[PDB]
Each structure stands twice: as C-alpha cells, then as structure tokens.
Amino acid sequence: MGLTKADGGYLVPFQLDPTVIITSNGSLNDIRRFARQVVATGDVWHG
Amino acid sequence: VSSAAVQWSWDAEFEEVSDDSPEFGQPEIPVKKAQGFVPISIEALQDEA
C-alpha cells in the first residue's frame, strides 16, 4: 500500500490553485507617449 | 346584441293574435395587429446626432 491510485492513492485530497498564469508575450509600444492624440465626434477627422 | 321591434296589429273583437316573436342578431368584430420595425448600427447610434 503506497501512493499508487489502485493501492490507496485514491484517498489523497486533490490540490488546486484557482489563480491563472498569463502565458502570452504581449507588446510594449511607445508611440502614444510621443504622438498627437485628438478626440473626434463623428466618423472622420479632417485638417 | 341587436334586435328589432314587435309588430302589433289592429284586431277586431274575438280575434286570435299572431305570433310576433322578434329576431335577434349579434355583431362580431375581430381584433388585428400592425407592427413597424427599423434597425440601427452601433456606429451610427453613437456618431449621428
């Protein structure tokens, strides 16, 4: 009788960590720190 | 409910009366439905004034 499932390993509680880990890379970009940002009202901006 | 009027008559002495039962009728009015519909985009609902 050890830790194998068929020899008593079915009595051990199952442990889970509900938190999720992000596995993507993402992107870090810096245009918006230098560029000119405007707020529009319709669907087209002219100049 | 609709009906008509009883039809009297001028009768002599010792004269049998006539059967003057009225005749009823019932109007009927069914109810019908009308609908109108116009969709909109999410874009226009925000941009248009």
TrEMBL record, chain B:
It is found in: Virion. Transmembrane segments: none annotated. This is Phage capsid-like C-terminal domain-containing protein. The gene is 6.
